[PDB]
Amino acid sequence: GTSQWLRKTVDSAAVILFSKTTCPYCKKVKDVLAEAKIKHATIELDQLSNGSAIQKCLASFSKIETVPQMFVRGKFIGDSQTVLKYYSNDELAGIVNESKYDYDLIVIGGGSGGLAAGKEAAKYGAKTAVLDYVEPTPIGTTWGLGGTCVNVGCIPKKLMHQAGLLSHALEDAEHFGWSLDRSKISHNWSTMVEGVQSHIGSLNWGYKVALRDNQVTYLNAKGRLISPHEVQITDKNQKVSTITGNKIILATGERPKYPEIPGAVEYGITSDDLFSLPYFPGKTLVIGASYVALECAGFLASLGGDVTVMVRSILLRGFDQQMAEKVGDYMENHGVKFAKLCVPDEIKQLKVVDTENNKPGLLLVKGHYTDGKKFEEEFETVIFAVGREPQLSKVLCETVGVKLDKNGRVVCTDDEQTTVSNVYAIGDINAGKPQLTPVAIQAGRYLARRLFAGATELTDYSNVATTVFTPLEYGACGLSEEDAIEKYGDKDIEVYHSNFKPLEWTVAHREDNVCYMKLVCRKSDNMRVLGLHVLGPNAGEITQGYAVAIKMGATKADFDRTIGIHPTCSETFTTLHVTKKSGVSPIV
Amino acid sequence: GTSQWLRKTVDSAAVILFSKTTCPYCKKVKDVLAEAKIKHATIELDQLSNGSAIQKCLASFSKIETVPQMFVRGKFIGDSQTVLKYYSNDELAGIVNESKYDYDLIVIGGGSGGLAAGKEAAKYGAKTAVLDYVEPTPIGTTWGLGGTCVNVGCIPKKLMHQAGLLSHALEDAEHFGWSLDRSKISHNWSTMVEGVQSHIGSLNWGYKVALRDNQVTYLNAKGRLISPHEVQITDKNQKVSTITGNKIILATGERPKYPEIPGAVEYGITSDDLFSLPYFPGKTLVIGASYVALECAGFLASLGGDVTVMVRSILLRGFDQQMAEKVGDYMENHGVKFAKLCVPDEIKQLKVVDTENNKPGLLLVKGHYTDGKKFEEEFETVIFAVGREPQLSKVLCETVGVKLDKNGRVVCTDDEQTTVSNVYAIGDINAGKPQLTPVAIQAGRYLARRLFAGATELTDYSNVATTVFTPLEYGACGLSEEDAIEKYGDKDIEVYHSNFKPLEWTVAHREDNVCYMKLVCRKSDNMRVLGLHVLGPNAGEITQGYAVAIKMGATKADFDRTIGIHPTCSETFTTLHVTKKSGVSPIV
Ligand SMILES: Cc1cc2nc3c(=O)[nH]c(=O)nc-3n(C[C@H](O)[C@H](O)[C@H](O)COP(=O)(O)OP(=O)(O)OC[C@H]3O[C@@H](n4cnc5c(N)ncnc54)[C@H](O)[C@@H]3O)c2cc1C
Ligand SMILES: Cc1cc2nc3c(=O)[nH]c(=O)nc-3n(C[C@H](O)[C@H](O)[C@H](O)COP(=O)(O)OP(=O)(O)OC[C@H]3O[C@@H](n4cnc5c(N)ncnc54)[C@H](O)[C@@H]3O)c2cc1C
Ligand SMILES: Cc1[nH]c2ccccc2c1CC(=O)O
Ligand SMILES: Cc1[nH]c2ccccc2c1CC(=O)O
Ligand SMILES: [Ca+2]
Ligand SMILES: [Ca+2]
Numbered sequence A, B: 001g002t003s004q005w006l007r008k009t010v011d012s013a014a015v016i017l018f019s020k021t022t023c024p025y026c027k028k029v030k031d032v033l034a035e036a037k038i039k040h041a042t043i044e045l046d047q048l049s050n051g052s053a054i055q056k057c058l059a060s061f062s063k064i065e066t067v068p069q070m071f072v073r074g075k076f077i078g079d080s081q082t083v084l085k086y087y088s089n090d091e092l093a094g095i096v097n098e099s100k101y102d103y104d105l106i107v108i109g110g111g112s113g114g115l116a117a118g119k120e121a122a123k124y125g126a127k128t129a130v131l132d133y134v135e136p137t138p139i140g141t142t143w144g145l146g147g148t149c150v151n152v153g154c155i156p157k158k159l160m161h162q163a164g165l166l167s168h169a170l171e172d173a174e175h176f177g178w179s180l181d182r183s184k185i186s187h188n189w190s191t192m193v194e195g196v197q198s199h200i201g202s203l204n205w206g207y208k209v210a211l212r213d214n215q216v217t218y219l220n221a222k223g224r225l226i227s228p229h230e231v232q233i234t235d236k237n238q239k240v241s242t243i244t245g246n247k248i249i250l251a252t253g254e255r256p257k258y259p260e261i262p263g264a265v266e267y268g269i270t271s272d273d274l275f276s277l278p279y280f281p282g283k284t285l286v287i288g289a290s291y292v293a294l295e296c297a298g299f300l301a302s303l304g305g306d307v308t309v310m311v312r313s314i315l316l317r318g319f320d321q322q323m324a325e326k327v328g329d330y331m332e333n334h335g336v337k338f339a340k341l342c343v344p345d346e347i348k349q350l351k352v353v354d355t356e357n358n359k360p361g362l363l364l365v366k367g368h369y370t371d372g373k374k375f376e377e378e379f380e381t382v383i384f385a386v387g388r389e390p391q392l393s394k395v396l397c398e399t400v401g402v403k404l405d406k407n408g409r410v411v412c413t414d415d416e417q418t419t420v421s422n423v424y425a426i427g428d429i430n431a432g433k434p435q436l437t438p439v440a441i442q443a444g445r446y447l448a449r450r451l452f453a454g455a456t457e458l459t460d461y462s463n464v465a466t467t468v469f470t471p472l473e474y475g476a477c478g479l480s481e482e483d484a485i486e487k488y489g490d491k492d493i494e495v496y497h498s499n500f501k502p503l504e505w506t507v508a509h510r511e512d513n514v515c516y517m518k519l520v521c522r523k524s525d526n527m528r529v530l531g532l533h534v535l536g537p538n539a540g541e542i543t544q545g546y547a548v549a550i551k552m553g554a555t556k557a558d559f560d561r562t563i564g565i566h567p568t569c570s571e572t573f574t575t576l577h578v579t580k581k582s583g584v585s586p587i588v
């Protein structure tokens, strides 16, 4: 392993120093480099099992076995004396900046994955460019640097969720002794959006500052990979240019799908538009049943909206369906209407949006139920949440040789490498991976370290925890119950479960036996926890810590031996005893 | 091990059936017992490593090696045919109810530990009595069944904390778009207390119902252990009686201390009084700096109170002092005044409490600072939070032979056994153990199973997670930083840390770089996580899950390999990189 690893590390690193903790000549070079403002990776051989072996294999590259040894872009540059020679002669800058390419790394896409990869790479001396361009939505919405999560995803979604939760805090406050006349309390959509957008703006700016502070070149331009190392960029002016890079990271993300029905693109909106919408949506129809559909419907209802969700078949396809049903039942019991087994046929315009007084328009939605009954209802706003899709040109990807799948996503090795060996793909366009911001960030940071600092650690995409920020939140880590039973068989699966009631809900007169948790375990494997599921407040805070234990192979016994923190919702995971096979009720 | 275990199991179990999954005669007996409403423990020998060996050792008790075998109170009763003989002859009830003692278990104390132990024991056929009596506070406050947490502890404390958090939710709601005139919003203490007390009342009742439903005898009487198996009880009428029990569980808990200064008992109150106080405390002085002191001060301030904490030396003695300082700094920045390095000398009455209009009285507190300056200030309410102490008579404990320590707590083996071998102690009076409700519950349930169902599992009291429900909450699991450095030395400890900002605080215009987390790790032991600490909202939900991983031996690498859930506070634990030794700032 050592020699193959060393060959790839030396070939790929932009500027790398092989060193030892204890080496005065190593510190000499480190200080000259720091003095010269030259960033680099460092591998301390004395902190590695195989450091001994590595130091000797280096002679296959350097002809020496001493430390320090500095390499630039695959070329041995020198020991301590040679580096100081270059420094003294003011040749060092030109050496560390010599390359066949304009950049060591070009990142195409300035979102969760691409910004994380670009910043991490720059730390090790990789001369880096990040390209980002936001193609406007059909009604012309655009936004700044940061990608989907920052601008039209997790960040504004969770902030609007919080605004919705505050509706229930206002209700609860009365029961806890606060004197407030809710009859006189209303919500102002545009005040909320202005606050959300001011925060997003601070993030757009912050990322630009972060890139500048790491000496990353930020180009607000559309990038097109036209050969393995050439990226064609088109700026706002439509000026076309070409830049070259050693490594390329595709991090271009996805955009919302529209259904192919008359009126959808003209009169509907998607999540891309919702989070900066200048007018309150008013009476709203959400078409779709993904976590985005339900999250959006949920906070619109809590903000006082008349909300309907049109569901083609099931809720939260791909998630544990028992939990999905409970999520939806809570929503229906708390205002959200569901038109189940229903699809849209056409959207007709009845009023145009009032761009002046910031009022919504009015739409007639025609569709049909599976039972043959017609759906025909007026809505002020119609939101499509029917899937997201990558935006890579299949043709041009074919030309360069980057393989895509059926769905247009990039087919990658377990180290994110595409079929073009210097080109990598991270984030939502990486076929088969969980489409989540912390996944993209971990992938991009870990990839940058393997490319430019000799790291070996891969991203682990197994048992990645999630949380759906519906009005009652749903956290999960690992297998759904049904997937566990399909994999291992019903006889090998035990499911421990319980209802519970947040203490906060008692004085507030909220529901018994609605919050719910379960552990799906494998009997044959010492009751290994295969999946954890919780429906309740703060479900993401609950779930996160357990994801560490699950990654370590937690068993039911590990949960049982841990002592609860009281009073919390999470502590119920430490005292589960009712199994599904026992038939005993999980109510409490 | 097998024979010693079997000897103790047979001796101690009230009614126990040795059985196998696959045994029709075993099911015959199980059904006769279920039919006869006879509860019992069951040990399925075919589900045990040493089942083979156990089945043969049973002959040392039964003279047979077959299953089923039923025992009552140390006596082999019969195989299947003998049990049905007794049943058919209507002798079985009298056999299973024959004992030298009135009860298999008497629990002295109806709180967190004692109720948990009593209910669990009853499940296995132990005829159980639970004694509970609430000695009134100096001003006459009393309450119902359930103990300190239910009545005057975790439950009302966290509910009043929630009422306080709702103050900040009301503030935040404006920034998230809600239209409310806070100038017109006030808090009504007595409305809050009525809601809290209605919930506590439902718990008092619920426990009484639970005891009835498990056939546990509940005596609202003061119990006194006068010999190993004899408990003298005094009812409300002052009628004295004596009942006998095989096993005794002492679960009597603690009560607040008062300082030995004039006026303290007459005019101050403690947490015992606060949670049902009929009048709003008004301008309040909390004397003490325990987690109870700070929790109480914190919610009183958030409910609009003018609050001062008088601190003799340090905050949260015994907790990580960096975190304690941050907890206190947050409180001071949010209204709570601190009279630091100050102790009280006397409490003088200026107004008596208005028991009619439910208004507080008025007190003059005289004390002095370490710098010699005198403290003299008027308060409407003075709350002592200076420690809690057990209430066991040292003399009578000596007589029976139950050893106490310096502090009056019971000295126990790691299986909760006192120096009187049939007498056990759980909960806050168990010397050296964490004084927490889930600890007491786990101890009592696990003890009941060892006594009456042949279990071997001990309670693990190591790395028990905690949360301090101050206005900004503080969760912890494992060693403080200072204790880790004392144990292993500064060179062997690495501390990863970061500030963070809840997304919820951004639009709400709350603080950057106040929430904080750290992992204290042992370098020599693969960066084992020795202590986890988090200051932030929902800190108990954050911490709980990680307690499972820490119990399993989590390392920093285990945290790093786990993927965050976004957006959450907890996910920051999965991306910590700044160490204290690096000197780099933890701000973000
Ligand atoms: C409503 C919604 C809510 C979500 N909520 C959560 C949540 O709560 N938690 C969570 O973990 N995940 C959430 N996600 C998922 C999260 O947004 C994605 O997983 C994450 O943004 C993907 O990051 P990425 O780097 O793959 O791509 P993106 O963040 O989409 O960034 C890609 C960037 O590249 C731009 N681009 C595209 N093509 C080019 C090109 N040729 N040249 C230059 N630039 C280009 C794109 O316009 C964009 O700016 C949510 C997503 C949505 C839509
Ligand atoms: C303000 C405060 C807040 C707290 N907050 C938390 C928290 O948030 N989380 C947490 O885990 N812990 C908390 N605790 C700790 C928790 O209350 C205790 O750890 C728990 O109640 C101890 O349970 P126990 O069974 O040992 O005793 P207790 O719950 O005190 O029960 C003992 C019972 O026995 C009665 N009794 C005493 N003597 C006799 C006798 N001779 N005969 C009959 N009955 C008798 C007592 O009156 C009482 O009813 C808090 C405690 C306090 C004071
Ligand atoms: C959005 C989406 N992805 C799918 C994958 C398989 C089968 C159906 C669907 C639907 C629609 C639906 O849930 O009916
Ligand atoms: C309540 C309490 N327990 C202690 C243990 C050791 C030293 C001091 C104290 C104090 C008072 C204080 O913190 O000054
Ligand atoms: Ca437990
Ligand atoms: Ca991570």
Ligand SMILES: [K+]
Pocket (backbone or CB within 6 Å): A287, A288, A289, A312, A385, A386
């Ligand atoms: K659909």
Ligand SMILES: [K+]
Pocket (backbone or CB within 6 Å): B287, B288, B289, B312, B385, B386
């Ligand atoms: K004190």
